[PDB]
Structures are given as C-alpha cells and as structure tokens.
Write an enzyme that holds these catalytic residues in place. Structure first.
Site, PDB file in Angstrom:
ATOM      1  N   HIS A   1      58.193  65.217  49.362  1.00 19.06           N
ATOM      2  CA  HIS A   1      58.052  63.950  48.665  1.00 19.06           C
ATOM      3  C   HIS A   1      57.305  64.237  47.373  1.00 19.06           C
ATOM      4  O   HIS A   1      56.544  65.208  47.298  1.00 19.06           O
ATOM      5  CB  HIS A   1      57.299  62.939  49.511  1.00 19.06           C
ATOM      6  CG  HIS A   1      57.031  61.632  48.829  1.00 19.06           C
ATOM      7  ND1 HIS A   1      57.964  60.988  48.047  1.00 19.06           N
ATOM      8  CD2 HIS A   1      55.944  60.822  48.862  1.00 19.06           C
ATOM      9  CE1 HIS A   1      57.457  59.851  47.608  1.00 19.06           C
ATOM     10  NE2 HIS A   1      56.229  59.727  48.087  1.00 19.06           N
TER      11      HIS A   1
ATOM     12  N   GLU B   1      38.277  71.978  56.387  1.00 19.66           N
ATOM     13  CA  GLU B   1      39.501  71.194  56.538  1.00 19.66           C
ATOM     14  C   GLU B   1      39.458  70.346  57.811  1.00 19.66           C
ATOM     15  O   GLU B   1      39.885  69.184  57.800  1.00 19.66           O
ATOM     16  CB  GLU B   1      40.725  72.112  56.521  1.00 19.66           C
ATOM     17  CG  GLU B   1      42.077  71.383  56.503  1.00 19.66           C
ATOM     18  CD  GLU B   1      42.735  71.303  57.885  1.00 19.66           C
ATOM     19  OE1 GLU B   1      42.202  71.907  58.846  1.00 19.66           O
ATOM     20  OE2 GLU B   1      43.801  70.655  58.009  1.00 19.66           O
TER      21      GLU B   1
ATOM     22  N   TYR C   1      29.487  63.054  32.815  1.00 19.77           N
ATOM     23  CA  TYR C   1      28.670  61.838  32.769  1.00 19.77           C
ATOM     24  C   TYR C   1      29.448  60.582  33.168  1.00 19.77           C
ATOM     25  O   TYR C   1      28.886  59.669  33.794  1.00 19.77           O
ATOM     26  CB  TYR C   1      28.111  61.639  31.343  1.00 19.77           C
TER      27      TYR C   1
ATOM     28  N   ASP D   1      47.629  65.498  61.135  1.00 16.23           N
ATOM     29  CA  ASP D   1      48.016  66.379  62.236  1.00 16.23           C
ATOM     30  C   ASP D   1      49.272  65.856  62.925  1.00 16.23           C
ATOM     31  O   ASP D   1      49.551  64.653  62.908  1.00 16.23           O
ATOM     32  CB  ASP D   1      46.901  66.495  63.280  1.00 16.23           C
ATOM     33  CG  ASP D   1      45.780  67.443  62.861  1.00 16.23           C
ATOM     34  OD1 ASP D   1      45.950  68.226  61.896  1.00 16.23           O
ATOM     35  OD2 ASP D   1      44.727  67.417  63.537  1.00 16.23           O
TER      36      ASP D   1
ATOM     37  N   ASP E   1      51.877  56.192  43.456  1.00 11.18           N
ATOM     38  CA  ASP E   1      53.197  56.443  44.037  1.00 11.18           C
ATOM     39  C   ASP E   1      54.003  55.156  43.977  1.00 11.18           C
ATOM     40  O   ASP E   1      53.605  54.149  44.575  1.00 11.18           O
ATOM     41  CB  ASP E   1      53.076  56.917  45.491  1.00 11.18           C
ATOM     42  CG  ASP E   1      54.389  57.479  46.059  1.00 11.18           C
ATOM     43  OD1 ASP E   1      55.493  57.320  45.464  1.00 11.18           O
ATOM     44  OD2 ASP E   1      54.309  58.052  47.164  1.00 11.18           O
TER      45      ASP E   1
ATOM     46  N   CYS F   1      62.722  59.457  45.621  1.00 16.83           N
ATOM     47  CA  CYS F   1      61.344  59.801  45.245  1.00 16.83           C
ATOM     48  C   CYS F   1      61.241  60.416  43.833  1.00 16.83           C
ATOM     49  O   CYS F   1      60.447  59.950  43.003  1.00 16.83           O
ATOM     50  CB  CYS F   1      60.738  60.705  46.341  1.00 16.83           C
ATOM     51  SG  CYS F   1      61.307  62.353  46.439  1.00 16.83           S
TER      52      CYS F   1
ATOM     53  N   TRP G   1      68.936  55.604  50.326  1.00 19.12           N
ATOM     54  CA  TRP G   1      69.099  56.911  50.946  1.00 19.12           C
ATOM     55  C   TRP G   1      70.378  56.976  51.782  1.00 19.12           C
ATOM     56  O   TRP G   1      70.451  57.775  52.726  1.00 19.12           O
ATOM     57  CB  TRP G   1      67.870  57.243  51.808  1.00 19.12           C
ATOM     58  CG  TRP G   1      66.584  57.373  50.987  1.00 19.12           C
ATOM     59  CD1 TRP G   1      65.971  58.535  50.608  1.00 19.12           C
ATOM     60  CD2 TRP G   1      65.789  56.302  50.441  1.00 19.12           C
ATOM     61  NE1 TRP G   1      64.843  58.255  49.864  1.00 19.12           N
ATOM     62  CE2 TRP G   1      64.708  56.895  49.749  1.00 19.12           C
ATOM     63  CE3 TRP G   1      65.878  54.899  50.485  1.00 19.12           C
ATOM     64  CZ2 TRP G   1      63.724  56.134  49.089  1.00 19.12           C
ATOM     65  CZ3 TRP G   1      64.907  54.143  49.817  1.00 19.12           C
ATOM     66  CH2 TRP G   1      63.844  54.766  49.129  1.00 19.12           C
TER      67      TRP G   1
ATOM     68  N   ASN H   1      47.868  65.753  54.833  1.00 17.13           N
ATOM     69  CA  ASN H   1      47.127  66.526  55.823  1.00 17.13           C
ATOM     70  C   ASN H   1      47.007  65.861  57.192  1.00 17.13           C
ATOM     71  O   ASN H   1      46.047  66.133  57.920  1.00 17.13           O
ATOM     72  CB  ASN H   1      45.724  66.850  55.314  1.00 17.13           C
ATOM     73  CG  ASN H   1      45.167  68.099  55.977  1.00 17.13           C
ATOM     74  OD1 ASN H   1      45.918  69.041  56.238  1.00 17.13           O
ATOM     75  ND2 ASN H   1      43.873  68.092  56.305  1.00 17.13           N
TER      76      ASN H   1
ATOM     77  N   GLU I   1      43.864  75.394  55.122  1.00 18.91           N
ATOM     78  CA  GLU I   1      44.140  75.397  56.554  1.00 18.91           C
ATOM     79  C   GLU I   1      43.416  76.557  57.232  1.00 18.91           C
ATOM     80  O   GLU I   1      43.336  77.665  56.691  1.00 18.91           O
ATOM     81  CB  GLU I   1      45.646  75.502  56.825  1.00 18.91           C
ATOM     82  CG  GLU I   1      46.497  74.374  56.252  1.00 18.91           C
ATOM     83  CD  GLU I   1      46.278  73.056  56.970  1.00 18.91           C
ATOM     84  OE1 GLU I   1      45.855  73.065  58.137  1.00 18.91           O
ATOM     85  OE2 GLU I   1      46.540  72.007  56.371  1.00 18.91           O
TER      86      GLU I   1
HETATM   87 CA   LIG Z   1      46.130  70.576  58.172  1.00 19.30          CA
END
Ligand SMILES: [Ca+2]
Ligand SMILES: [Ca+2]
Ligand SMILES: [Ca+2]
Ligand SMILES: [Cl-]
Lengths: 684, 7
Positions: A353, A462, A518, A418, A376, A300, A265, A416, A457
């Site tokens: 990403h 969530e 199944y 915070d 990844d 990436c 990078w 996700n 959200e």
């Molecule tokens: Ca969130």
C-alpha cells in the site's frame, strides 16, 4: 454564514461615502490610482525569489511570510502630509478582518517581522514602489487586490481587476512558516519536482511506476483551490497545513464528499479509466474541475499521486511512501485477527500500500512530533465519520504514542501489527511492514525509510513500542527527570520507579534521546539504550543514565531542545509505563564587550567575560576570540576557574575591514566544552 | 499493482 469558497466574491464599493455627503463635493482633491504593476512576469524577481516562476499561470503568485514588489501609479505624486492609503487583500464572499479574510495592508515606515505591511522603497514622478510583506500564517488561496484611498467623506477604492488577483501559497523557504524545510535539496525534490516514481510490486520484486504530478501545469493550482471549495473548507483554516492536508485526505477520494477519485478494485472498471492506465495527476484533476464530478477510477498509487500533486501545488512539502505487506485492520485492535475461516476473518494484508507524507510543525502536539506526517487519501477505514486518514506523526508512530491525533493507531497497524492466528494458535511478529521506501533525492533510486516508522524487527524496543501502542489503543509508578542539564557538559537522566505493592517485579525498558528543533520538528536520535532492572517490594529505585557531551554536542543547533522517550514493561504483569518529555539545555553565557572607538585603523579593546556556571571547578580553560577583519585570532588560557567565578580577558586589536563585523568567542575546558558568545560590531 | 494476499 460560512466563508468557505475561494471562488465566491463580494462586491467592494468604489465610492464608499459615509454619512450625508453634500452635493457638490469635489473628490478630485484626492489620489486616484491610474495603474497597478505587480512585476509578475515569470522571469522577474518576485516569481523567481518566491519559487513560483514554474506555474503556467499569468497572475502574481507569491509565498507567504516573504516580501514582494509592486508599483502604484497615482493621479499626482503621493504626499504623506495630505494623502493616506492602504492596500487590501480580500477572499471569499463574506470577508472579515478578524478571520484573516479581509487583510488591510498599512503603508509603514519599516516592515515589522511577521506582520502585514507595505514599505515605500522608491518614488519617481507619480509612482511609488512598495515592498509588501505578508504574514507567515496567511490564508492560502487566491486573493483580490484593491487600493483604498481614505478621505473625509469615506474611502475611494479601485475597481475589481482580475489581472491583479494574487495567489499566496505555503512557503517552505520561510523560517517562520509552519511548513519550513531548512534543506534546499529537499525543497527542490519535495516542493518543486513535478515528476516522481512510486514503488510497488513485492518486497523481493520491487517495481517502479513513473508519475507526473504536474503541479505547475495550467489549471492545476486553480483546481486545488476548487477542491477545498468543494470540501466546503472554511477559508480561515486554509493557512493551517494540518487542516489542509486532512481535508485533502478526505477530498482526494470520492466517498462522503464528491471528492476527486472513485476507488475500484473489480478488474472491470465499467464506464471509466482503469486505475493502471493513468500516468500522472493532471488529466484526473482537470477532468474533476471541468466535469464537477468524481473521476473513475483509482487505487492506492493513483490516490497518492493526486494527493501528492495537491500538497506540492499548494506548497506543502510532500512525498509518496510505499509499505510492503501493508496491514488493513478492520476492528481497530491494532493486530491482524486471522481465524482459513474466510467468514470470520475480516482483516487483510496488501502486497503493498502507499500513502503520502506531508511536512509541517505540529503545534497541537507536544514538541518532538512535527516533521513528516502520514496522510492517506485511499479509502480504507472511517476516521470520525469520513474516509480520511491523518496527519499522523510518523515520530509518534515509531514510539507507539498513537494517542496523538490523527489516526495514528491505524497507520501503526499498517506498518507493524502482529499476525494473531486464533484459542491463539500462533503469532507472527515480523511479517507486516517488511520494508518502507520513497524516491531518493536527486535520482530515481529507492530510499529505505523503514526506520522512521518503527524500530528494527527482533529488537526489544520494537516490542516495547508495540505494547505502548496497544496500550494507548501492578502498583508501579515510573517518572524521569533530567538533572541540571548544561550545554557542553555530560548530564544525568534519572529514571525513578516506585513500587507500592508487596511484589518483586522485573522491568525491561528502553530510553530514546533525541534532538529537536525549536519548533518541535524532530532532528535526530542521538542515544538509544535498553535496560533491565529488578524492583523490590515497597521500595523506590532510581536508575541514573549518563548522557555524555560527545553523544549530543555534534548534532545541536540554535534553540534546539532534547526529547526523551522512556518505556518500561513490568514483565510479570506485562503492564506498560510510557512517558515522553522535552527539556531545554541551560546555556552558559559568554559576554563580549568593546571599549573605545571602533574605527578601521585605530585601536579598540575587546573584553571577553565568562562565569563558571557549575558547582565544580573548570580546569585548563581555553578561551578563543575570532573576528575576521576585526582581530587576528587570539587565545587565552586559564588553568582553573572556581565555582561561580568570573574571569575577564582584554584583547587589543585594530580592524582591517569597515562595516558590520562580528566577534565570536569560544570556551573549552576539560569538562565543559564548546560554549560560545557573539557580538555584532560596526566598524566606522 | 495492489493485491490482497490471502492469509
Ligand atoms: Ca513487527
Ligand atoms: Ca472523500
Ligand atoms: Ca484486527
Ligand atoms: Cl472512493
């Protein structure tokens, strides 16, 4: 001694004599092979029916769990009274039958489901045509083929012949294969499409980069096998898409293992190709094989492009997904710790990403967590000592069940986590993972798949899913059961809370009800509810959730199960209680019998029998009988069928079509509905 | 076009 290289081979003897064979033995008594035909042209039915006609490769390429044709020409006509032979498929320098790397293929009267075998389907002069069936769990790789003739003196085997070397790949078309994908349009896009688009930019300025995966170009399949050799990946594990995709996530990057691509990078990219100059995977992969050293450089989307080629090339359905505002958690606490103090702050967020999803069952996880798995190859964090990531069940991530291997807590944080500005000054619960997209089927447009990774959200679920994930990282017990669940009827989901403390608590919870294939592959969420309940001290409380027949009957399929998530927060303590369970619906039976001869033009009686499976009375029961060519459609009404009572319906008919026919019966009443039975019938 | 966005 590890059998970890497809490229290495052992030398199988051609005259495998046993004991002290006397001088003067005459082996001319026995069959010898004069020629082997694989019908391996790219226009012929093997490569077409196996969907391998696009590879620029002149050897036979087939997909496991599916039959293909070959022909063996012998020195005289095969005679099963006096001759005995088998085909052999062999891989690696140290093949062993109990490891799946020496594969004897017996000549059998009838192929057996799931088992290696070869059936003679034609004999002409000195030739036999074989239908060869492989196991749907077969090792994926390039096998050597031999024909072995058994004699009293030992085995006589064909010489090494690279022209019959046979590639066996993953088979998304085979219903017994772990990578089975039941949708033809999805198979074309996620297996057979060799170009694609990678989305990038920013949420409000979305850009597209074309990418040439080129998995069918000359040399690429061989390179993918080479990558696994360079990983020292034991051949016995190369039939397992979990192990193949996880090895792939390590090996596509150069860290740890001399893998394919060196990440950089630094905006200079000394002595290499700048990451933004590549437009596809082929040049990178072919340079890796020819130089036998990592290629400089990638970021990436280049890692993802090359990883996508690897997966699709081997036959694992795969796609590239882009996450806008993608969090990089450095200390595995599943949140962004922002102190800006640039020395104390280590966590970071990318404008975007991108990574890969690969499609497979997860027999190592409970049912419900198969399907798309996040993998990844971009190096970010170590996973068990190496830069790799996944496969992580996307469905596990969505519900915060990040305890299931592999690396699900990290992928959860990416989509996700915070933002915590820290004493804690501020929390941003909505910034990370604003939008997640992948190329649409049959066009270059954008498919929003954010909902597959997380709840919306602002929604309580969530929050509850995130607290579950942080918990997996009050004296209240939570369990739930499904009360007597019968296909075709409403049923109750009973959630019980047991409060052993002296405290009054409030509870906020959600329920997710899902249909599952199944094999454990998720199909769809059919019910989602949040609810609040108060919990008195020293008490137990049952909260019954009605699941109406209409909510699920439209989305069922054969041997599907139901997968339920329940997650409850105790509000006064923030404790989380999270459970997941699957159940199979009790299936009412309808029995069809036929009496009399089943001749096209004479009369036969069809007997439809139904027993009321409930403790309640069924009312206005309509039974239908269907059978194209056998009977015109007919209907019988029963006003009432008492509990555990059996009714029987006799219907005379005369078939209009000979051969293998089918009878289908249906039952619908005021409560129980759309229960079926079936009977195959041969009409002479 | 990956870029780290500063907090
Ligand atoms: Ca969130
Ligand atoms: Ca690596
Ligand atoms: Ca953190
Ligand atoms: Cl690297």
């Amino acid at each position: 001694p590890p059998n970890n290289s497809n490229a290495a081979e052992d030398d199988l003897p051609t005259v495998e004599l046993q004991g002290v064979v006397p001088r003067g033995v005459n082996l001319q008594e026995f069959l010898n092979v004069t020629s082997v035909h694989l019908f391996k042209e790219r226009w012929d039915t093997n490569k077409v029916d196996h969907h391998t006609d696009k590879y620029e490769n002149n050897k036979l390429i087939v997909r496991r769990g599916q039959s293909f044709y070959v022909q063996i020409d012998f020195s005289r006509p095969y005679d099963p009274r006096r001759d005995l032979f088998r085909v052999e498929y062999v891989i690696g320098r140290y093949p062993q039958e109990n490891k799946g790397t020496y594969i004897p293929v017996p000549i059998v009267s009838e192929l057996q489901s799931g088992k290696w075998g070869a059936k003679i389907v034609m004999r002409e002069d000195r030739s036999v045509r074989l239908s060869i069936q492989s196991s749907p769990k077969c090792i994926v790789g390039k096998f050597r083929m031999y024909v072995a003739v058994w004699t009293p003196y030992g085995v006589l085997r064909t010489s090494r012949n690279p022209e019959t070397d046979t590639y066996i790949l993953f088979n998304p078309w085979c219903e017994d294969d772990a990578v089975y994908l039941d949708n033809e349009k999805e198979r074309e896009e996620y297996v057979l499409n060799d170009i694609g688009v990678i989305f990038y930019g920013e949420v409000n300025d979305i850009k597209t980069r074309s990418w040439s995966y080129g998995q069918f170009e000359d040399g690429i399949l061989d390179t993918c096998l080479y990558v696994m050799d360079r990983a020292q990946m034991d051949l016995s594990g190369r039939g397992n898409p979990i192990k193949v995709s996880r090895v792939g996530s390590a090996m596509v990057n150069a860290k740890d293992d001399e893998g394919v691509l060196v990440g950089s990078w630094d905006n200079i990219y000394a002595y290499g190709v700048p990451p933004s100059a590549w437009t596809g995977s082929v040049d990178i992969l072919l340079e890796y094989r020819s130089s036998e050293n990592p290629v400089r450089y990638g970021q990436c989307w280049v890692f993802a492009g090359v990883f996508n080629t690897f997966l699709r090339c081997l036959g694992i359905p795969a796609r590239i997904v882009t996450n806008y505002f993608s969090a990089h958690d450095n200390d595995a606490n599943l949140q962004m710790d922002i102190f800006v103090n640039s020395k104390l702050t280590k966590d970071s967020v990318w404008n975007y990403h991108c990574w890969n999803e690969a499609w497979m069952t997860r027999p190592d996880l409970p049912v419900g967590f198969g399907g798309w798995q996040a993998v990844d190859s971009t190096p970010q964090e170590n996973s068990d000592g190496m830069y790799r990531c996944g496969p992580a069940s996307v469905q596990a991530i969505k519900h915060g069940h990040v305890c299931f291997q592999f690396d699900a807590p990290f992928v959860f944080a990416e989509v996700n986590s915070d933002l915590i500005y820290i004493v804690v000054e501020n929390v941003d619960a909505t910034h990370i993972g604003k939008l997640i997209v992948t190329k649409q089927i049959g066009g270059d447009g954008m498919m929003d798949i954010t909902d597959t990774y997380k709840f919306q959200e602002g929604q309580e679920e969530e929050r509850l899913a995130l607290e579950t994930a942080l918990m997996y990282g009050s004296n209240v017990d939570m369990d739930f059961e499904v009360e007597n669940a019968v296909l075709g009827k409403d049923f109750k989901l009973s959630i019980t809370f047991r409060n052993n403390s002296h405290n009054r608590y409030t509870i906020t919870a959600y329920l997710s009800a899902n249909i599952t294939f199944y094999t454990g592959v998720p199909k769809a969420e059919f019910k989602k509810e949040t609810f609040d309940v108060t919990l008195e001290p020293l008490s137990f409380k049952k909260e019954a959730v009605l699941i109406q027949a209409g909510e699920y009957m439209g989305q069922l399929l054969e041997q599907a199960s139901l997968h339920f998530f329940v997650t409850a927060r105790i509000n006064e303590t923030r404790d989380v209680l999270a459970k997941q369970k699957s159940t199979v619906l009790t299936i009412p039976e309808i029995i069809i019998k036929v009496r009399g001869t089943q001749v096209v033009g004479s009369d036969m009686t069809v007997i439809v029998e139904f027993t009321n499976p409930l403790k309640e009375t069924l009312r206005n029961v309509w039974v239908h009988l269907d059978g194209p060519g056998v009977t015109r459609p007919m209907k019988k009404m029963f006003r009432e069928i008492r509990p555990n009572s059996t009714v029987q319906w006799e219907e005379v008919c005369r078939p209009w079509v000979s051969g293998h026919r089918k009878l289908i019966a249906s039952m619908s009443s005021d409560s129980l509905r759309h229960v079926y039975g079936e009977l195959d019938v041969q009409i002479q | 076009x990956x870029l780290i966005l500063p907090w």
